């Protein structure tokens, strides 16, 4: 096929329409991406906060092993339990 | 050019006319593909991080309950642990 300048004009409009839709999708995905990066940073800060508490409790239990305290022994079993 | 005999072009001349626009479309399509993949990886990473938060939080809550249940002992070591549990920053 050889094509009219009018069919080209409509072909150009089609491409411009799809370009607008893909730009919208980029904007939506960039906003989502920014929110996910914030959420992972905040979640990792909570992990570090809680992990620090567990490490300090571990140190207190280790320092008091001489006491032979069954309550501290139960806490050590919680600290060292797997998932 | 008349309405009977309009200017008519090859699909190759059209390709060269539209090539710049098709190149810009390709930039945004590839950006969509890259961002969709990134976002899927981030959603998995947040699920795994939230599971670790729940795991550690469960340990802290269970230790809290044991400390509360033994408050009658007046044990300064348990009091140090409760200080850790209830401490900020």
Author numbering:
A (entry chain B): 24 to 106
B (entry chain A): 18 to 106
What does the published report state?
Lamins represent a distinct class within the intermediate filament (IF) protein family. Lamin A (LA) and its splice variant lamin C as well as two closely related lamins B1 and B2 jointly form the lamina, a meshwork of ~3.5-nm-thick filaments located at the inner side of the nuclear envelope. In line with this, the primary structure of lamins reveals a central α-helical domain responsible for the CC formation which is flanked by non-helical N- and C-terminal domains called the head and the tail respectively.
Crystallographic data for the LA 17-70-Eb1 fusion construct were phased by molecular replacement, relying on the dimeric Eb1 cap as a search model. The crystal structure was refined to 1.83 Å resolution. The asymmetric unit of the crystal contains two copies of the dimer that are readily superimposable. In line with the design, a continuous CC with regular left-handed geometry is formed all along the length of the chimera. Importantly, the structure gives a glimpse of the interface between the head domain and coil1A, as reliable electron density starting with residue 23 is seen in all four chains. First, residues 23 through 27 corresponding to the proximal residues of the head domain form a β-strand, facilitated by a Pro residue in position 23. Two such strands form a short antiparallel β-sheet, further referred to as the ‘β-lock’, which flanks the N-terminus of the CC.
